[PDB]
Amino acid sequence: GSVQPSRDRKDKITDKIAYLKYKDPQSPKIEVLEQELVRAEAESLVAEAQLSNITRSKLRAAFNYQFD
Amino acid sequence: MHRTYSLRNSRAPTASQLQNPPPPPSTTKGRFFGKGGLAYSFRRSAAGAFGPELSRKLSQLVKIEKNVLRSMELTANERRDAAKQLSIWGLENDDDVSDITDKLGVLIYEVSELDDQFIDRYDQYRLTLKSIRDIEGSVQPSRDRKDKITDKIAYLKYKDPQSPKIEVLEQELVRAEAESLVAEAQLSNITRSKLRAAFNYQFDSIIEHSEKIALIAGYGKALLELLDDSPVTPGETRPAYDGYEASKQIIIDAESALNEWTLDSAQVKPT
Amino acid sequence: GSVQPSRDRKDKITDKIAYLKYKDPQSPKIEVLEQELVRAEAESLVAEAQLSNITRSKLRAAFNYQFD
């Protein structure tokens, strides 16, 4: 649930990028939004990796404890 | 700066100062403020109060240089008006004075046009700086979030180490730290690459403008020989002016030299 | 004036293509609109060529007659 806002922000920012590049490619925020998008993409990649590790490690452990 | 090992406001004179003593301070430095305008001094303060903390000094610089640009366009219009007034006033005097004043007004109008072109280039450089201002202002929320999250981590680990959000907040903090590291790297690259490029463009505009005005000054100084300082006794009068062709040739040569000027044609060679 | 509707249609169709490919790339009219755009582009290229020839040939001739 805490990871989800990261990807929500990523999709919102990429939607804004698409809208700005479609309506007016020569926008003042031509590349600042793109750089913010790429740093958010790096953060979301780290978040997805840690989410996968923690989910798959606490599923195999909580269910192991439950089965014990 | 031409300062000296002294505790006074006096500055070390240069070779030009030794050859030509400096004139007294201008009589236009009247005591009101030197302000120019209330909006001029309030726009900067308004820009320097709100907005992101990181993009605060840069916004102040952008606003100050916008005021620079406004005052420069004002002085360009003022100088072109002065040239027009000189050309108008040249009629009442002799033919040689009229022609010389007309050519000088043409040169001053050309200087004003070059000033306007430099104004456009300055605005381009200001927009280049505005881009880095915007990117740093967008970067600032990332680090603001990082500090807020680390403060929350410290508070939670101090008040109750066995909190339900024991490690989710830490993982969110580390991913935010990775994002902030990428943001800082890209901010450094873009800031340091658009500072060295916007200022390079600004200096190119500066040297081009300076060379063009230097050529204008030299050509006007060579034109001023057609004017004569010979005084006439009250009874006598000069023969008719005949230096029209010389002035025409000198202004044609000035225009040709200005048109031919390029970046590689600059004769200024710094050591 | 008769040539102008061709380019007006070309810009309208390319705007529609951009809008459709931004809002939903997997649109049912995925490639029919693109093919219509390319055939309109060929028609507009022929129109521009003939407009240039006729304009530049009747300017040099009408003005030659006027100068005569």
From Swiss-Prot, chains A, C:
The UniProt GO MF terms for this protein read: lipid binding
Localization per record: Lipid droplet
Q: Does the keyword Chloroplast apply?
A: no
User: Does the UniProt entry include the keyword Phosphoprotein?
Assistant: yes
GO BP annotation list:
eisosome assembly; endocytosis; protein localization; protein localization to eisosome filament
Highest taxon above the source species: Eukaryota
Major place of localization?
A: other
User: How would you describe the post-translational modification of this protein?
Assistant: Phosphorylated by PKH1 and PKH2. Phosphorylation is inhibited by sphingolipid long chain bases (LCBs).
Keywords annotated in UniProt: Isopeptide bond, Lipid droplet, Phosphoprotein, Ubl conjugation
Q: What is this protein called?
A: Sphingolipid long chain base-responsive protein PIL1
Give the organism, scientific name: Saccharomyces cerevisiae (strain ATCC 204508 / S288c)
